[model samples]
Every structure is written in structure tokens, then in C-alpha cells.
Target chain A: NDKASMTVKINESLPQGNGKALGTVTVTETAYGLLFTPHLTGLAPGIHGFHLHEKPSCAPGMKDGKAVPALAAGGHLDPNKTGVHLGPYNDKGHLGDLPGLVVNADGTATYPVLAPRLKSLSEVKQHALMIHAGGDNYSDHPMPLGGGGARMACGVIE
Target chain B: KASMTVKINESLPQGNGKALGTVTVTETAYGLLFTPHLTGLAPGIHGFHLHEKPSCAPGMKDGKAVPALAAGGHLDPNKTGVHLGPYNDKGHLGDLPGLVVNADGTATYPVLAPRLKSLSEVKQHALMIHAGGDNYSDHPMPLGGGGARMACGVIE
Candidate 1:
């Protein structure tokens, strides 16, 4: 199969998931669309909301002089500016929203994700990727962004 | 002189008490100076930002939901669309220096942002903290690789 690829190293942050693993996420262009294979370890077996962000970097900064995690990456790549938080199954969410990552009890991830809407690997080079500490409900409800809490890990899609 | 002070917190259910610390923003001819006194944090450098909104409401961006996501991005009223650094000549108007935590989880780092004017400019904005540090460059990593949002406060 034709393959175009990019790799992002996910680093752990504080307030929760820290010193975990230097997980490497590889975005591979597949015939169907895209496949993200994370070559990381030491992840708690559970669900994590994963997606590509707008900014290319993954540095933190101050908001109104207060601290915010991964402040530089900006929001998800919303070149269209939909301002909606739907999931990959629907047309409302950002194109960066991919399937949830399920880690195994053995400290490894479950399966490779098939981000169906992805067209090219180059589109994400200028963006940063994030692994939310919590899970995604896909629907905007009790939590506005699918209840995905905390930024477990992050990587620059360079 | 125009000024404002806020009580930062970890919000409800996420954190226990009334506060994590306090942040004082003052307006001077030189610019706006931020003095922060906080505790109960990991011993390391943390990312700090002045959000566009005044609320720490939970919301999502890109996809996953995050705490204090409602604060929105940095306060770039000019919409310069760049994070050059703490230098007033460059970066966004809301950009500030990073926060350093001590071994006992206490931070007392004070920094300045020359781009900011009167306290009213950031009066209704939100202050936030990231779990990590800031390199001040928007490349290879965004938000200066500050990591997760650790704390927040609404500037009154």
C-alpha cells in the first residue's frame, strides 16, 4: 500500500499523567485515508481522546498571566472555523478529531487507529497532536468537548 | 494606578479548597506586571497564559474535552497570530514568562509583559497554568510545550 508518514513523540505532562513514556505516534497515509500507529508504552489501559491541533508547537504558556497546558499549540486545525466539537463519525467536529485510543492492561495500546477523513500526511505537519488524559464521549453533553479531561501526552507533528 | 487581583483555583471536584493561590496584575507606564504566589504544584516549570475569556468552564478543542478550555486562546486582541515570546515587540499581547515551582510545590516567580496596558484591558480575562514549562517558540511544540492546564483564575 502507498504510505506517506510522519512521526510525533508524545511527552507526558503534570497535574496527572507524568514521567510516563516518550510515546511515538506515526501518522501513515493509507489507501482508505490515514492510520496513526503510536509506538509508546506505560499508558494506563483506558480511553484517551486523540486529535491534531492547529499550532505546530507543543510548548506551555500563561493565559492572562495564569498557566495553561500546551498553550502554544492553539486549538485543533479549524481552517474552516466550525467551532464545533463533534467526533470523527460526524461532520461537525474538526478534521483533526480521530478515533479514541484504547490502551491495553499490559501498558500497550489496543489497535491502530484509522482516521477516515484524513487526506494527506502533509496537512498535519504544521499542527501539534494531543492525547487527552480522559476519554471522549463523541457527543457534546455534560462536557463540552466530549468530556475528555487533561492532556495526558503531546507531540509536534513534524 | 489601575490594577486587579484574582484568586486562582483548581475549580470544583478537580481541586479541594477555596484556592491554589493568588495572581495580582497591575498597570504601569512600563507595562503590566504579574506577581503570582501559589503552592501545591509539582516541582518544575509551568506554562502561564492570559486567556481571552473570563471563565474556566470545561470544554473541548480539536476534539477531547479539557479543563478550563472555555478560557479560549491567548489574549491577542491585535490578532498578531504569533507567539514570539515575552518581549513586547513580538509574540501575542497576552504572552508572559513561565512559572517556576519550588521543591515543595510552591511558586513565586514574577514576570512582565510590556504589551499590556491598563488593568481593565485584562480585567475580565482568565489566568491559567500549564503542567510543564515554556520554550516561547511555537514550533516542534505549541504553547511552549507547557503541557496540561494545571490551574486557573478569573480576573475581577
Candidate 2:
């Protein structure tokens, strides 16, 4: 169907802060993979780590003694429970890893990125699209999940 | 096909007071297919773009009335700030191909935006048609010298 595509409305997930609307990210299942086309703005300039999380909720939750942002969404999606974090291209890693979302100097992210390993949108439905403060190296060593810091923005895939 | 109607800019009301026809947008595997079925346009090729805002109301620019100025500039959410045409990845994502209006003042041509990955990027934005033709260049005249806004419609 021509209307098979879905748009996810993303919002800023802050600690005890009201979620601010950033924009929408369209997800389409393509032959190559799932195409993530971001039409969002009002983000910090530069590359931010993008991923699909285990849960659908983006509410801030407590971690340790302080409140964490989008903590309720849980960790990167690992349906197989592989306990790996090698990134998107590798099947050995968790399935949630996506290519770094590139935000322009003007804070808008119109560029389209892809997730080659993801064959269908069903695998991602009801999950959260998480944006991190740092970039992902697609590796486990040095830092976990490329050391993408706090979750900045998140959206639920409905 | 998901369709949206393009109306004459609020700044330039039609003599008969009628809204322009629709532009059907379809999401193809390769890109977004934009088919313009609009009428009552000046006979010629017109520059078309996906502006940032959803409003087509005329807004003041430097105390001068600008047609469809509230729609803002072309959608460049990627912030590339380039105006290279619909297919170029380096240009603004909002840049669309030149719309061909026939001698009878109808625009039936379909344009493909290969760079646009989906329709979600264009939803809630304004589709603007310029008064003049577009060369898809930044040389000599900026923004392809589209002159003024002739027609506009918000993609609902």
C-alpha cells in the first residue's frame, strides 16, 4: 500500500522537564532496509546517537540517585538477548543500533539514514527511537554502545 | 494518492474567488512522487518548493507586503542552505522540480523528488509555486529567481 509508511512524533526528554516537540521522523520499510527520514529541528548541532529502545515509553525514570532522561524506555533493543552492542550492521550486536543521526548547524535533521539489518517495521513497532547526546562508534569496546550519553529526545513507534 | 489543494496566495486573491486544484503526493519506493493537478496558473513552467511553515498568509517583510511570506523559506531542515533542485542531496530537502503549467493554465505534470525518502517529511508544510520558471541554480539570481509567490497550499 502507498500509505504503509509511519510518522513518529519526537519530543525532547528531559529530567523533570516538559517534553518539547521537536518534529517527526518517518519510517518506511524498503528493500534495502528501514529508512529513517528525520524532519526534526531544535537540536544541538552535530551527530547524535540514534537507536531503537526496548520499551515504548519515553518518560524519565530514576537511575541510581538521580533522575535519568528517557530511562523508562530501557536499553537498546535486544530481542534475542544477545547481550552484545556491536551496532547496526552487525547481526551479532543488539538490533537497536542505528547510524548516527546527523543534525545540521541550524539544529535541523532532514537527512535520511538507514538501518540495513532491520528487514521489517514490525520488529520496531512499539519501540522508542532514542536520540543521545553523543555519537555512536558502532563498537562495544572503549565505551558501551559507542558511549552515547544521555537520551536527549525520544519518540514511540506506534 | 494523498492529495492537497493549492490555493492562490492570500496576498493575490483570484478574481473569481476559487481555490486552486489539488496536488497528489505518493510515496514510491525510490522517492516521493508529486503530481500537480492544479489550474488557473499563468501558462508556463513555475518554480515549486516545500516551504517551512504551514501558513500561506501574506506577511510583512521589511514593512513591505510579501506574498505568502508567512510560509517562510524553503524547507531546509537539514540546514544545507543549498537550492540545488529536487534530486541533489546537497541542497535543501524542500527543493522540488519546476512545475509545468500548460497553455490552458493547468499543471498536470508529475515531478519526482528522489532525495525525499517519505511523505512524512513534507506533511504540515507549505507547498509554494513561484511566479516565474526555475533553472535550479543559485547563479546570477538567487533562489532560482522565482520572483514572487503565485500559489501556495499547506500539505495537510
Candidate 3:
């Protein structure tokens, strides 16, 4: 009988340019978990890594003496400091880890995904939601952060 | 940006079984920007408007249940019964641009409501999409001949 929801407007993460509008994602609390319903477009087709960052800022920052996209948002939301990347279903990983965001070949993502481990929306309130450039393997063995590459799009949850 | 819940018309075919999608509203310098990423609507143009109430439930129309009749009429805060479309100010304030659905039943295109200034004025209202297209006026037909309420969502 409890209901809580919020909308986060996403934009492209650019180092030197202004972010372009990429639509929005509405996070709502459900009986099973927190449901993230995306209403977005203009992205490469296929799966993209999705996560909640520790900070609420999506602005770029300097890294390795160069500007990086959305670096100001900081690392994944690791309240327990798990420092692991073991998918959304596991408790040993960062609390920010989420399921991969699937974009259709037409560049739209209208399907809703659930975060079973995320019991409530309050846990991620005032954080940064990020979409990476590639897919996630839910592991840190092959590459760091499952080889998701750079931050593609970002939004601040308020 | 504000994303609201959009659902199927309760009085229509599916009995409001599943949610259609969401409508993202952004306040821009020009006006209010509307970006819809919805599915399961008949392809073509649909009339979109903001209603006075904050609910999308079916309400009594005469003796029968009407689709989203509980949403009341278009947002007419100034008591203007006219329907002069989204560009005009002398008419209803809820008249937004028509929504065009694609062949795959998706509405990815963005529309602008130039008359609206901010999200504060639209929050707690109902956003409704009619079955037919809007002509931006009440010429030979009343209310731009937009048919029944096909889908609705509450802006929050």
C-alpha cells in the first residue's frame, strides 16, 4: 500500500559540450522491488550498463590530466563499501549496481526493469543514475566495472 | 523533468490492464516540453491535453462509465471554454500539440506546449490523449472532434 516515485531527466555526458536531452526514467516502489521505467531515445542499439553513482552531480571532471564525462558523479553507490561489481541480485556488490539497460534497434528504451535488491526508492534518492557505453558482465575479472567503458548518459535523482 | 504514469483507457478495449508508458514534461524557455515514449496505441495522430483533475479513472457519464471522465474538462483555469490549440492564450490552457504515434505503436517524438511556462502549474493535473487527431480549433466539430479518451496519466 506504500507508493513513492520520482522522475530523473537524463542527458548525454559530454566532456566539453552541453549534454543533450535523452529523455527520462521514472523510479517507483513496488511490492517486489524498485521499478525503473525508462522513456528514452537516441542511443546506440543494444545493452548498456546502468548504475547509481554516489554523487548527485553529472558534470564532467578532470581525470588523468584530461576532462572526463560525468566524473563529478563519483563511483558507484557503495554505502557498505562493498567495492564489488556482482550484479543487482547479489548483496556482496555495490548497492548502486543495476541491471543492464536494453535499447531497441530503433534507439528506444520503453521497457521497465526491476531492481530486486533495491527494496525502496529512498535508498537511491539524491543520487546520480548513469548509463555506460557498453554491457556489464556483473564481474570485475575480465575488465574493471565489467568493461562498460565510459559514461554515456547521466541524470541526477532529486 | 517530470515523468507521470500513463495507462490504458479503462472503458476501452483492454480494461486498463497494463500501463501504456510515461510522458516526460520539461519546462523550457519556449514553453513546456513534452516527450512521450508510449506504446499500444493505434498508429496515427492523437489529441493530447491536460485535464483539470489529477486522476485518470473512469467516471460516470450520464449512466455509463466513461473513459477518464473523472479527469474533468481541459485545464481551463481562466474559465475559457474555447479550444484554440496550444499556441493561443485566449483559449484553454490545457490544449497541447497533437501526439503522433508510429507504426510500431510507439510515440517517441517530442511536442512543445508553447503557452505553458512551468511544471508547477501543471503538476497534480491529468494528461489525456484522445483517440483521434486535433485540428487545433472548433471549426465544424466541437473540441476539435477528438474522440474518446484513449489513454491518461496523472502529472506529479
Candidate 4:
């Protein structure tokens, strides 16, 4: 029997901040794992931390009038109780820990990541994917989590 | 120098076996750019590319796949051919190679097509993300297995 598959498209808009960062996301599933790829445009050429939060509301402007750090999404997507900041291959880290999204001179980024422990695809209906305004060292540092800054752009998994 | 972006995630539709992702698209440069954000994705190297039309509906109806059909064909910028291979620049412009996802469940993509200079040129088109990886050459499948249509989104 063949596994049922589908494709998703992301709609981009202005983030809550004044930075030039732009957000674009894509979702898919395969026999190996779940893949989350994000493309960022109009950003400074450098390393920027990225992650998926646990919310699905996009109200324009910060969620609570407070500048929420990207980590505010509440840890990584480690549903299996894995540690945190374990890179893509290490099974001991959060499933949502991406290998840092990079921006090019043309203000664009091509991020490729996967989650191995993920059991199925139907579980992403209530959560939201978010990009941060900082960089990630793949470890908890000055911020308990990766030093990823405020939430830049966010969208629900619908 | 226009740019685009894509995001991927994962989720289930039933209990746990059903994996899915929700993708969104946005473009700057007065619609010269087209971006897509995805969710509920399964891991591994999957093919990702742009298609014609702007319909992302699923399933078949009236013995015809409405959404799939409405998506039209692959986004061919040259308008000189059809769905060829991503590595083959001689084919249709929509023949851009697909993307690959890593093991940490995250992929950030940003692709640029200079030929596409306005949203109006892509607004009425459809963007698609396949379920397999692109070999960039003819080997297994013509267009890399022509994998299952995992998800779809319109450039609105």
C-alpha cells in the first residue's frame, strides 16, 4: 500500500517587527521523517535562528503586546522527551531544532530540516511555525535555550 | 534580484499515521516574489517545486481531480516546453529542482526566478511541493517519481 501524501503552500506577510526579515514555510512527509523548509527574504546576510512555536494565531504585532523571543514557542518540538539543541542527526535533541537558517546577499535563504521521531503528519494541525530574530548555537546559552531573539514572522499549520 | 521562501512542518490527520503540512505563499517586489511556508511535514529529502495555477485543494471529485487540474501545469517561465527535469534548463521554467529536508524536522528555502518579475505573472499560478527528491537527471522517475502530491498552495 502507498502512503497518502499532500503538498502545502505558505502565505507571507509583514512580521510584527521593523526588520527586513521575510518569512516563507513549506511542510511535507516521507518514509524517513517530517520535513520543514523555510525561505527567508530581505534579511542581512548572516545566521538566524529558527523554530516552530506552539500557537496558531496571527494577529499582527506581538502576541501579548510584549516582544516574545522565538524560544517563547516553548522549547523545541521534542515529543519524545529528547534533550534540546541536538542538531538534525542527534536523536537526543528537540525535534524542532533546525540547523540555523542562512540569508544570502540577495536577501534569501534555503533551509532544509527533518524530524525522525515524528509518528505522523496529522499532529501539526494546532501548532504554528515561527522564525526568530536572532541566531542559534544549537544549545542553551545566555538564554537557557538558543539565544534566538524575538519572534519575527509566524503562521498557523492549516 | 527577486527572492522567495518556503517552510515545512509535520502533523497527523487521524491518529498518528497521517502526516501532513500546511504551506503558505507570499511575495515582495510588487508581487515579483513568491514565497511559501509549510507545516505538518514528514522528514527526509522530498521534491519541492512551483507549479502553474493557484489551487491547493485535495482529493478527486466527479471522476476528476479539480484542485489538481486547476493547478494547471508546471510553472514554465520560458513558455517553451512542459514538465521536464529540474536539471535540464532547456525544459520548462517550472523544471526547477526539488528541495531536500534534513533529520531535525526543519527546512528553510528561498529560491529566485529572475524571469518572474511580477506577482501578476505568478498570482494566477499554483505552487506545489512534491513528496520525493529530485535527481536532477533522468533515472528512476521522469520527474523524480512524480511523487505523491503531499501539499498545495495558491499565490494569493
Candidate 5:
């Protein structure tokens, strides 16, 4: 509804920061969980980490003891401060975690992913949804925050 | 069956002293009607739930237990113990739709709880609005990460 319109933007300052016009994401609520339909182009052709963040601002704030791109949006949407990045499928990690977003052979990634941990669109309306350029193992062994580094896109859910 | 409308006040007694809003609980052909007329809400969606107890007074529980702890948890007659969502039959019995607030700090959105058919179908309940929003589930955090208790009222 970019209008709670989830506005996804290519951060110009990040590595994948081409400032290119990616696309938008539409989330539909269901009895089981949330359905996220990403409509974007010119994205990498592979698996990427997709998640809902806690902050509403992607304007480069501070987090993890360092200044990073889109840091303003804070960390994952772990409202309870679980501090554990257990990926989306598990019930332990942040509520915003979703299955890796797969980019097609072309620049299009229109497939929809469901978030089992996500309660509904209400909490989603008050935070930011993000996409990372890398894939996520949904574990804390390799990288923090599911190893979803290099934020490729971002959108405000409300 | 007896029916009535109720008032949702600030979770505090003169804490932030002001008129918050009133909710008209009615039994309609569709379902139990919840017509909320609220004010001083941040412009966005907020959490609206019917709690087990009717006491909005501060009680003890987990955290500080200061504000609306008397409201207890969501009314779960079925003991689902699952905070799925408003439309989920296996979820909390107190689940209701989200409340939307406009730019002028007012809410006119009304929703219906289809599961309950009568006003007295449940016990003395507490209607509460969370500071942020609710996803219905206690995931990622607790209580849908709904933040603090903004306003509360006893359903008499």
C-alpha cells in the first residue's frame, strides 16, 4: 500500500550502491504467516538475505559499534532483543527473517516468500524491510545477522 | 444478553492525564462490533487486544508490572496458548483487529470479532492498545513487539 508502501531503494553508498531503481515489495497477510512479493529488477541473479528491520530510517545510523550503511535502520526486527540470528525458518531468530530471496537469471526476482515467524502486517507496518546481496545460512556460526552483509535494498513497511 | 460501550483511558491515573478514547462494544448480526473512537495516537497502526482481566490497574507479573499488568494475557478461553493472530481460530481468544491512527492523532477504524457472538460471551476483559503495533504472535520478541501499553480500559 508505498503509499505502508514498502519502498525498496538501492543504497548508493554501499558496495551494491548503484542507486539503481530496484523495485517494490508487497506483503499480504494470511492465517499462517505473511507473504512477501518482491517486484524488482537489475538485482543479482542468486540467493540473497531478506529481512524486516527494527528501525524505520535507512539513513545510515549507528549499530554493532561501527558506522555502516543504512545503520540508521538499526538491527533486525527482534523486538524482544533476542540478539540471536537464527534465520527465518526457525522460531528463535528475529521476526523479520525470511527465506533467502532468489533472483532469477535475468534481473528480475518476483517470486514470493513467506515468513513463518512474522506475526502479521501490523508489526511490519512499524519497521523497515531489507534485502542483502549475499545468501544467509540463518545461523550465528559464520556471520552475524545471518551473514546477510551488503544491504542491497531497503523499504519502510509503514 | 446485556451489552454496553466502554472507555479506554491512559494506562495511568493522571499519568499522562487526558481523554484517550471510547470503544462501543455491540452485538451485531455480523459479529461483536468494536467501534473505537480514540485520540492522541501516533499516526500509524497500533495493537488492539482484549485481555483476560478487566482490571487496568498496575499489577505484578514479569517486567516492572507497573502499568496495565492487571489486564493479564490475551483472553484465551480455548487455551490455545498460541498468539497466532486475529483471524486464527487456534490463537488467543482475545485477538482483535489492529487500530489505525491518522495524522491528526485520532482513530475511527472499527473491526469485528467473528468468533464471539455475544457481549457477555467472555468474562470481564481489558481492552488495551500497544504503543507500537501487533503481529499477534509473541515471536522475535514478546507480544508482537507491541512496545508499551499506550491506553487501557476495563470491559464491564
Candidate 6:
């Protein structure tokens, strides 16, 4: 069972309000945890928050043209008693909290993150994956959830 | 202007597995629409969602956090606003709901929007297929019980 590993590709089309940003993510499940490496293209250089939302539906213009928070998808991947918006390494937060995404001038991001105690891939089906508008400070503050802005791009995990 | 197509197959431990279903993605002017043709699924609700990062490499460790942590947190484009549930328009962007599989193990999923611009926006991303079901409420669990990830594919 542990030997069984898997990978999921994230194909997203984001409305930057300026242009479109596209990219791909590669996730491998290891004995330690899940390793995530993203090779994104056509994005702005800065800090962007990321997560493995709960639902798998990406309906646009949810709730009266405004992106529905839950319909858009919700929260990080914290199956273990961790609270919400808890940055990575914050044993009290969701395991999906990783460092902020740094988009290079070329619009490509290549980074690695992990998820500990992910019961099994069989658990998170029919969910949506999402990217935030701003960066993640990994702490709640003037800007909740790293100050990431509006819902940019979304996709269903399954 | 770009698009992606994903195939859902019975996942194994890096060995033998069967083809369970397939999903076709078409990019529209506003966002991407996914049409899933599922088979061999159990008759019940199935949990699902998108992962942060996209690296499905086997033989690696399990439960280890990544550096950038690209594949972990919630898809809160609103920047950590709410929890995971479709009750209102104040939660995260990944709180849609679980998929319902038919008894024949064949489910046809129609156009589930990802709230993006087009397929070109999400190249190199990771798509994961999970097990279990989702209730779409946050009373007991914040984002419903969509279960864990079981299978994954890259949009190439």
C-alpha cells in the first residue's frame, strides 16, 4: 500500500484581469510525504499563495457573478487536526501550506513542497485545486491567509 | 487558446492497474470545462479537488512537506478568506462538492468550471482523483468529506 505512488497534473487557465497565466504541477507521493514540483509559464514574478482545495467544482461567476468561496473551492489540505491557513511547518495548520510561489521573469515556477500524514490519495476525490492572487505570509494578519487576493484560476482534482 | 485531456485509470502501487475512466478538458474564453467519462466507479458519492503542485513520482516518501508547498494549502484565491463548503460565496475557491458515481461505475461529469481563463492558464498543473464522498458542509468538517487523493494525471 505504501509502495503505491501516484502523480496529478494541474491544468489551469487563470484570468489575471490583465492576461492569462498557465502552468503545470507534478506531485509524487513518497514515503515521507507528497512532493509537489510545479513548472509554470506565463505568470508574474512575485509571491502567490497555493493550495489543494476541498471540492472539485470550478464553476465560474459563482453566486451572482462573484466567485463563490466554497463553490470556487475551499481551505488547504489539513486532514490532521491542524487549523485553517496554518503555514507549512506549522504543526497546527493544514499540511497543504507551502512556501509562497515565486514567478520568475520568464513566468515559470519550479519548486517543491510536501504533505505529511495524507491518509491516502483515495480520500480527496472530486475536489478543486486553486491559486491565490497574492502571497502567503503563512500567518493570519491584516491580510488573512497570506493576503492572497481574488480567486484567479481553479481546477478539479479528479 | 490551449487545452488539456486527462485519463482516469485504476491506480496501483507502481505496478498493475486498470483504466477506470477518462476526462476531456476544453478551454473556453472564460475558463476551462471538464467532461469526465467514468467507469468502474462504485455507486456512491466521491470526494474530489485540485492539488497545489503537480508531481506524481512514485518510490518517494509519503507525508513529507514540500519546500514551496505548492501542493498543500487550500485554493483560496480570495486569500484565506473562508473554509471549504458550498453553502455561500464566502469560502475558499476549492469548496465545490463530491462527485456522485453510478452503480455501473460509469459517471459522466459535465463542464465543471475551474474559474480560470483558459487551458493555457493551467499547463503543467496536477489533476488528482480522490476517493470517498463530500457533503459540501463545514459543520463537522469545514470543506465536506471529499476524501483523499487516489489517482493523478498531468495535463500535457
lDDT of 4 by residue, B89-136 (tens): 455566543543433444434333333445466565555666666554
* DockQ (model 5, Cα): 0.03
Query: Scoring model 6 with DockQ, what do you get?
Result: 0.01
Off by over 4 Å in 1: A15-21, B1-156
State chain A's TM-score for model 6. 0.74
Per-residue lDDT tens digits for candidate 3, residues B1-156, read 443334434235333546777777876444576778788887666788999999887777677767778888899998889987775667799998777676687886556676787788888888888987786788867676787987888877
Q: In each prediction, how many residue pairs overlap at the backbone (N, C-alpha, C within less than 3 A)?
A: 42, 0, 0, 83, 3, 105
- Candidate 3 residue pairs in clash (backbone atoms < 3 Å): none
Model 4 misplaced stretches (Cα beyond 4 Å): A1-23, A58-75, A80-83, B1-156
Interface RMSD for model 1 amounts to 20.0
**What DockQ values do the models have?**
0.01, 0.02, 0.02, 0.02, 0.03, 0.01
Docking class of 3: incorrect
**Displacement of the residue A128 alpha carbon in candidate 4, Å:** 1.5
* Per-residue C-alpha lDDT of model 4 across residues A1-158, encoded as one tens digit per residue: 34434333333324432333356566656444455555656654555666655555433445556554333335456677756665443456776665456554455666444443343567565565655667776677666447776555555566
Candidate 4 CAPRI assessment class: incorrect
The per-model lDDT (C-alpha) reads 0.70, 0.78, 0.78, 0.50, 0.69, 0.53
Give model 6's docking category.
incorrect
Largest TM-score belongs to which candidate?
Answer: 2
DockQ score of the complex predicted as candidate 2: 0.02
Task: Tell me how far the alpha carbon of residue A88 in candidate 3 is from the true structure, in angstroms, after superposition.
Answer: 0.7
TM-score of each predicted structure versus truth: 0.47, 0.51, 0.51, 0.42, 0.49, 0.42
- What interface RMSD do all candidates show, one decimal each? 20.0, 13.4, 16.0, 17.3, 14.1, 20.6
**Could you give the candidate ranking by lDDT, starting with the highest?**
3, 2, 1, 5, 6, 4
